Design a protein around this ligand. Structure first.
Ligand SMILES: [Zn+2]
Ligand SMILES: [Zn+2]
Ligand SMILES: [Zn+2]
Ligand SMILES: [Zn+2]
Lengths: 186, 182, 182, 186
């Protein structure tokens, strides 16, 4: 395995399709809305294992459009235990509430999906695990993609980091690019 | 989707190919050595969302032979943070230490991969989420599977549960069947 | 017990002395920098047990000045695993980066300790556990406190919530009061 | 601080009383039934911080008799989310089910309390954190106590470990001593 893939439990396309890699090359974690929560033991131990033990040099976080987890985060109904998991997504919503407010209602979900990926790569790059790997000169790249379920194509996004400094630049640029609106507003 | 599939992060077969089902039918969680740890918020919330919100009626836990997670748990090297995750597998090894001891060292892993699946289904069945769904008459079945690629085959790992009664029985029975040695 | 007290692991005053209540009244959780992290199974299950089983009607979150956890979160050294826990505090610093920037460096910590308490009460109030108790008319109040031992005093840190309405209002107001600088 | 204290959220006696130490010497974690769950980020990060950063040389896990968490684990009602936390206690019950079965019903709780502490010290000593500290020759002792709420006195138990080898011996001996029954059976 040369790639750690963090995808959503909704996503129906296996990482094999979205990476074009042969089975065997992918180590895969899947959770609701493809999160890297700072203190999630499950995902963190996967990342530490991939980076420190398997010496994987690429981590891909992949979100997707029409994501039930994102939709569920936004609908904010009393879904039970999962609501607590999705509160990290609502924090990201409100961190970007002015931006999201400028979009037409039916465009906001897919913007949140893209913002989410950027935020999760930013979290991943700040883990003790990735920061330490970078500090000691280990080769490690982080990638944040979004897959369009409608037209079955990727969108590389451009969140790519190979060090703590490019993490800052890449994260900032991604949010700046997301803030430039097309025909999503009236 | 109609199925929740809980599988391993180092598994090399997609759930869609194992199940031979539509891309659409499977809601998927993957973690190291396909665990349902009692207090893991990640897996538990997947389960709660699947059972209570998506109204899924089948949960599959799928292990596999030649599992790097099971092997790591057994090697017990200083791997770092991941060792803490895998201590749950070491607890499983010790629980079945007598059985696993009376077996050739090169065969222990694959026995442990199967025992592990039975233990995780038993854990799944004891979650507040699943207990309470069974208590209120909700239709819900748990399946423990192991796949092997020396060739290409499966085994509904003797573990099938539709209630807490059938969970005790199926769990104990699955352990007893595994205890008969080739 | 009638109170759940959530405080800091490096706090040097017992909850019983702060509250001046009986040994018996306080159910107690302590973690580093007194956090209510959305997905922390440890704190959340304490909260659920306290609210749903013990039928406790008051939750206090208590921060303190000269907090080693807040200081660690700010120093951002390579401390190891603990840094991951404290990233939630760094997220809080960034959220209030403009406010904290227009303040003397030796005063930032104590401002951040207070902001932190307001943020954790807001988190507590947004748990499925507390939301749902408020929705079904259950009597339940949340209090954010900071104590200071330059001398010995408290402050119900402007944060008091008995509903989701009063949570938004009290949260925003607590932030606004903290934003007026001495 | 020279002591990390892991106690129960029930316990009403502050660690100051049970250790006789001055305020300032104790770093304290409290959770339901004083557990060290292998993958609990909260408690593990506390332990890693105490051991690696604060250079604390003593960790005390303290349970107590008449523990609501233990009682709640045993009653096995549908309490909700907390049931999942307490499932680690029921695993310990069934790991020792033959022993517990020989006791009179009204003696079983306080035996589970003692067994629990032993099991939690054993977990603590197996963390990557404590095992590594020991491996590199760091001075670190683990202590498992139980406080009797009825007669306001401690019971040191004798779970004490200063290395991985004494962890095995101490844990085994503790369970062996717990298995020798007084007048708790008929
Ligand atoms: Zn999704
Ligand atoms: Zn595997
Ligand atoms: Zn503190
Ligand atoms: Zn207790």
């Amino acid at each position: 395995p040369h790639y750690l893939f963090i995808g959503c439990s909704d996503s129906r396309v296996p990482a094999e399709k979205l990476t074009n890699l042969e089975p065997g090359e992918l180590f895969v974690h899947r959770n609701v809305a493809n999160q890297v929560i700072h203190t999630d033991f499950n995902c963190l131990s996967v990342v530490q294992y991939a980076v420190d033990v398997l010496k994987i040099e690429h981590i891909i976080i992949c979100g997707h459009t029409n994501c039930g987890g994102i939709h569920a985060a936004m609908a904010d109904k009393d879904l039970g235990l999962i609501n607590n998991w999705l509160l990290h997504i609502r924090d990201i919503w409100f961190k970007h509430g002015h931006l999201l407010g400028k979009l037409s209602p039916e465009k906001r979900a897919d913007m949140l999906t893209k913002i989410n990926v950027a935020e999760q790569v930013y979290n991943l790059g700040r883990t003790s695990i990735v920061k330490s790997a970078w500090e000691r000169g280990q080769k490690l790249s982080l990638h944040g993609w979004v897959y369009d379920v409608n037209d079955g194509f990727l969108v590389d996004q451009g969140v790519m980091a190979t060090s703590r400094e490019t993490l800052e630049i890449s994260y900032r640029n991604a949010i700046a690019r997301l803030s430039i609106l097309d025909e999503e507003n009236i």
